[PDB]
Amino acid sequence: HMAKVLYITAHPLDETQSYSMAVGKAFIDTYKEVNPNDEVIHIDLYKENIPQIDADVFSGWGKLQSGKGFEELTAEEKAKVGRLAELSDQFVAADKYVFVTPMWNFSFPPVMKAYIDSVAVAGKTFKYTEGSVGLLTDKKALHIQASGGIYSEGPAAEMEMGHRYLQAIMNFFGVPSFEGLFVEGQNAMPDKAQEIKEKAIARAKDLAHTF
Amino acid sequence: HMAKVLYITAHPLDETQSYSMAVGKAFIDTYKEVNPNDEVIHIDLYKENIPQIDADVFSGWGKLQSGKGFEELTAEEKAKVGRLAELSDQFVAADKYVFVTPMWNFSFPPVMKAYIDSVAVAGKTFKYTEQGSVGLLTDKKALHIQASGGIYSEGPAAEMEMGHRYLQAIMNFFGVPSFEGLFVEGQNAMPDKAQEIKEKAIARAKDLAHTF
Numbered sequence: 001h002m003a004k005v006l007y008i009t010a011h012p013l014d015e016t017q018s019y020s021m022a023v024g025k026a027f028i029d030t031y032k033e034v035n036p037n038d039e040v041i042h043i044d045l046y047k048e049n050i051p052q053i054d055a056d057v058f059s060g061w062g063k064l065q066s067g068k069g070f071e072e073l074t075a076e077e078k079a080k081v082g083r084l085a086e087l088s089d090q091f092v093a094a095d096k097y098v099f100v101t102p103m104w105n106f107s108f109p110p111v112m113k114a115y116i117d118s119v120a121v122a123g124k125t126f127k128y129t130e131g132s133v134g135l136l137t138d139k140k141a142l143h144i145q146a147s148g149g150i151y152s153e154g155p156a157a158e159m160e161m162g163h164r165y166l167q168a169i170m171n172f173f174g175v176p177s178f179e180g181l182f183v184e185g186q187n188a189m190p191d192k193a194q195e196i197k198e199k200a201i202a203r204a205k206d207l208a209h210t211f
Numbered sequence: 212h213m214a215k216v217l218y219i220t221a222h223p224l225d226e227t228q229s230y231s232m233a234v235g236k237a238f239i240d241t242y243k244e245v246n247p248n249d250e251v252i253h254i255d256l257y258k259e260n261i262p263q264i265d266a267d268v269f270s271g272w273g274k275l276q277s278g279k280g281f282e283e284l285t286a287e288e289k290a291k292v293g294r295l296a297e298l299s300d301q302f303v304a305a306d307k308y309v310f311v312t313p314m315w316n317f318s319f320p321p322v323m324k325a326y327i328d329s330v331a332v333a334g335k336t337f338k339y340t341e342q343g344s345v346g347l348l349t350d351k352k353a354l355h356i357q358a359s360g361g362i363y364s365e366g367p368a369a370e371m372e373m374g375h376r377y378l379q380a381i382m383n384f385f386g387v388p389s390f391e392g393l394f395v396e397g398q399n400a401m402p403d404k405a406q407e408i409k410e411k412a413i414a415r416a417k418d419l420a421h422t423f
């Protein structure tokens with residue numbers, strides 16, 4: 001139906017155990033409520049196959065750029081290169097992206113990087129210039145991130161690396177709108193944890209009405 | 212014996228196909244020449260199992276926090292939890308870290324994140340304080356050899372650099388008083404200078420190896 005949305009989560013736990021998954025689920029449920037015709041796909045990076053770039057991938061790709069045909073690749077190469085192609089094609093096919101992550105050591109879980117590596121593809125999300133130009137000029141994106149401490153303000157802002165990275169990628173891809181929604185401070189101020197969660201949930205629902 | 216050095220690589224390919232790995236090899240070979248008694252340990256992130264923190268890990272951890280013995284965890288939980296514990300212990304036990312990576316999409320391969328995740332442990336590499344945190348690796352030092360197609364050491368692309376930037380944040384977090392970089396950069400942007408770029412970086416690696 002009218003827009004395709006990728007709800008992309010990088011968390012091993014669910015909405016009952018995670019600040020990020022709780023806020024993301026509030027967002028996405030509300031979104032669907034408001035845009036009942038839209039195709040909303042949950043991409044759970046912990047459950048799906050998300051191949052890291054490895055020796056097989058490089059081999060396979062080498063092959064393909066040497067004119068060979070997908071048929072010439074080894075089994076394992078086909079499995080991996082193939083999946084990478086599905087992932088990539090699914091990404092460009094969608095209209096909106098919603099990234100949901102916990103902050104682990106100032107950034108996101110490793111699989112989020114695997115996911116990015118799988119979708120950053122010449123001719124699909126960007127193309128090179130006589131630097132590069134992003135092809136995703138009419139997409140839209142949102143990052144929901146949970147963190148123990150505050151990283152929106154203060155000295156600690158300089159250490160934020162998750163959102164920062166995603167912002168860089170979005171820029172690279174030419175996506176003009178990248179929003180952030182943070183559930184921050186629950187670990188630094190645990191008496192405030194319920195309040196922090198509730199307000200983020202409320203912001204998330206509100207944001208869903210417009211995204 | 213002597214000093215314990217972790218030579219940490221995040222690459223599927225080897226010294227013959229990789230700029231980072233070639234430069235890293237020059238570095239660490241020289242290091243061992245200069246410091247023959249030092250314990251140089253290759254941590255090959257594409258050969259070791261570096262468990263991502265997953266459902267099994269949270270479960271296993273929670274169990275241990277709940278008083279269960281390690282042997283009471285599931286087979287899977289035990290494998291992952293034990294593996295992470297080893298990685299963590301190994302990191303703190305070492306005196307020096309050498310990170311070698313390619314730049315993929317402005318940062319490093321996913322497994323490098325896994326590795327960091329495995330070694331970032333409260334009471335080991337840092338401690339929480341009512342004021343934030345404090346680093347515990349006050350006697351360590353680190354170097355990062357990074358390879359990239361284009362140039363990230365100036366100007367506008369420098370704001371896009373995220374690999375070295377990340378490792379710098381982590382090292383600061385850990386309280387590591389010294390973290391250096393060595394870049395092999397520009398080889399794709401200016402392929403008619405790739406050989407020279409490489410040769411120069413290799414020379415730098417050999418030089419730097421005399422002090423690290």
Ligand SMILES: Cc1cc2nc3c(=O)[nH]c(=O)nc-3n(C[C@H](O)[C@H](O)[C@H](O)COP(=O)(O)O)c2cc1C
Nearest residue numbers: 018019020021102103104105106146147148149187
């Ligand atoms: C492995 C790990 C690493 C973490 N690293 C950080 C960090 O660098 N900064 C921070 O403020 N909080 C950190 N935390 C705390 C979490 O960010 C916090 O619990 C947040 O709610 C995580 O999201 P979740 O609740 O969706 O899991 C970390 C937690 C874990 C388990």
Ligand SMILES: Cc1cc2nc3c(=O)[nH]c(=O)nc-3n(C[C@H](O)[C@H](O)[C@H](O)COP(=O)(O)O)c2cc1C
Nearest residue numbers: 228229230231232313314315316317358359360361
């Ligand atoms: C998956 C992938 C992603 C890459 N991303 C970037 C990038 O963001 N910026 C860049 O300058 N070069 C990029 N490159 C090119 C490499 O950084 C360059 O080839 C470098 O020499 C890689 O190190 P290596 O020779 O040790 O493998 C990328 C290459 C690959 C395979």
